[PDB]
Design a protein around this ligand. Structure first.
Ligand SMILES: CO[C@H]1[C@@H](OC)C[C@H](C)[C@@H](OC)C2=CC(=O)C=C(NC(=O)/C(C)=C/C=C\[C@H](C)[C@@H](OC(N)=O)/C(C)=C/[C@@H]1C)C2=O
Length: 213
């Protein structure tokens, strides 16, 4: 069964601002998701310094981006620390975030949307280009779970019996809007990566599908 949770009020406001923003430079969403992926990789690697066994569920540390054109989906995967069920629930919606209201105020005063990561709330930049999102996550401390939001006032958390096992880490599965399908293109993804994520400690893999000729 799927469990349903209410978003904290300000987080619902933020999603609503972001999903209904005409604004330019939407490409910044990729920088933010790569940064989070990199943060999740830092954590597992730092944890592993004193607990090497933690790496064993997925010994390769990578960031991997997979266009799925038929579904109009873009997936960004990392083999970082992952999140437990309680973490998905608490950290992705139910609990007020320090920077939510401050960012919205900054935006309202003229701040660049790309400042979002500096307010600690950059995950929500995915709504720039997606109308729906699944966060699929496996922490060493829990089962694999699916968190899901359509920017509306509630999200669901479901035990994952439908997706590939990840050994450890997270997949952000972005259901792209019809006007943002450009982010399925290899050439476009490489440009955005090379522009705004030059200094990343982990390999960034692009999964490309090609008809044999
Ligand atoms: C143990 O740290 C967790 C996370 O706690 C559950 C840490 C915090 C949410 C916070 O630490 C200060 C943030 C750490 C970050 O690096 C980025 C953030 N910005 C966000 O917009 C949010 C809400 C990200 C949340 C989950 C995200 C999909 C994550 O992205 C992944 N896992 O790829 C994420 C950064 C999860 C990390 C690994 C944080 O809050």
């Amino acid at each position: 069964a799927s469990e349903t949770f209410e978003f904290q009020a300000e987080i619902t406001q933020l999603m609503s601002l972001i999903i209904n923003t005409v604004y330019s430079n939407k490409e910044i969403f990729l920088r933010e998701l790569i940064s989070n992926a990199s943060d999740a990789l830092d954590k597992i690697r730092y944890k592993s310094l004193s607990d090497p066994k933690q790496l064993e569920t997925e010994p390769d540390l990578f960031i991997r981006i997979t266009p799925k054109p038929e579904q109009k989906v873009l997936e960004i995967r990392d083999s970082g620390i992952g999140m437990t069920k309680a973490e998905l629930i608490n950290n992705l919606g139910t609990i007020a975030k320090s920077g939510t209201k401050a960012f919205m105020e900054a935006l309202s005063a003229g701040a660049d949307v790309s400042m979002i990561g500096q307010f600690g709330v950059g995950f929500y930049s995915l709504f720039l280009v997606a109308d729906r999102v699944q966060v699929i996550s496996k922490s060493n401390d829990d089962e694999q779970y699916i968190w899901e939001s359509n920017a509306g006032g509630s999200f669901t958390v479901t035990l994952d019996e439908v997706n590939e096992r990840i050994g450890r880490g997270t997949i952000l599965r972005l259901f792209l809007k019809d006007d943002q399908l450009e982010y399925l293109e290899e050439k476009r993804i490489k440009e955005v990566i090379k522009r705004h994520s030059e200094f990343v400690a982990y390999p960034i893999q692009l999964v490309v599908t090609k008809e044999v000729e």
